[PDB]
Design a binder for this molecule. Structure first.
Ligand SMILES: Nc1ncnc2c1ncn2[C@@H]1O[C@H](CSCC[C@H](N)C(=O)O)[C@@H](O)[C@H]1O
Length: 230
């Protein structure tokens, strides 16, 4: 009964869920109403974060702490980061369906000690999520941003371009938080998003700026990361 045509979301969901069970021992339940993550592309981003935050010798090994902005119903970045690397995550969500599924997915995989799923107000991002945080420095923030039109026949094109305004909000919050987080990062869907974002960091005098390209056959993605550390 499960479709063999990989253009059908039922086949993409079955493949994601099977891959996670077989390769990572992670059993997840996700709705067809929400974005279905593709594991290879999610892994590329986790590995890029490993490289950014640096390697530790046994004597200097610590618990790494990260924030996932918009964790989705799958809670895919925290589930992978926690399972593969033992990383701690603060995983945020504004969507109620996504929040319930993410919380349930963390519980069914007994990862509540490493992943804290939180429902945040729609107007909030990083600043509010870290309300009066003065005990720890987070190693990273990561984000697969939503496609909001403004926040018609060209609604899709408009929604895709809404990625730029969402990343600009992460940049805005980073200018206030600064060294509270070591690396700020975001995944980009369009190559044309990179140039205006790099320029916005340059004019704001952000000392460290880096970027990469993730490729999974047909699908091409970019990621941008920045830091206030010298
Ligand atoms: N301000 C905000 N804070 C937290 N989550 C937000 C948000 N605005 C939107 N979101 C959520 O961000 C998500 C973007 S889709 C990315 C889902 C997941 N990280 C993946 O890679 O598959 C959506 O689930 C949306 O509800």
């Amino acid at each position: 009964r499960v479709s063999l045509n990989f253009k059908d979301p039922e086949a993409v969901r079955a493949l994601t869920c099977t891959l996670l069970r077989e390769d990572f021992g992670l059993s997840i339940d996700i709705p067809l109403e929400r974005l279905i993550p593709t594991v290879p592309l999610r892994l590329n981003y986790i590995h890029w974060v490993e490289d950014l935050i640096g390697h530790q010798d046994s004597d200097k090994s610590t618990l790494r702490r990260g924030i996932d902005i918009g964790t989705g119903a799958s809670c895919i970045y925290p589930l992978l980061g926690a399972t593969l690397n033992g990383w701690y995550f603060l995983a945020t969500e504004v969507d109620d369906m996504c929040f319930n599924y993410a919380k349930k997915n963390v519980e069914q995989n007994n990862l509540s000690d490493l992943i804290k799923v939180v429902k945040v107000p729609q107007k909030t991002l990083l600043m509010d999520a870290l309300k009066e945080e003065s005990e720890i420095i987070y190693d990273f923030c990561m984000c697969n941003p939503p496609f909001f039109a403004n926040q018609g026949g060209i609604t899709e094109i408009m929604a895709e371009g809404g990625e730029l305004e969402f990343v600009k909000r992460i940049i805005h919050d980073s200018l206030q938080l600064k060294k509270r987080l070591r690396w700020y990062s975001c995944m980009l869907g369009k190559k044309c998003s990179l140039a205006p974002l790099k320029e916005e960091l340059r004019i704001q005098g952000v000392p460290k700026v880096t970027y990469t390209e993730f490729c999974q056959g047909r699908t091409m993605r970019w990621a941008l990361a920045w830091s206030f550390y010298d």
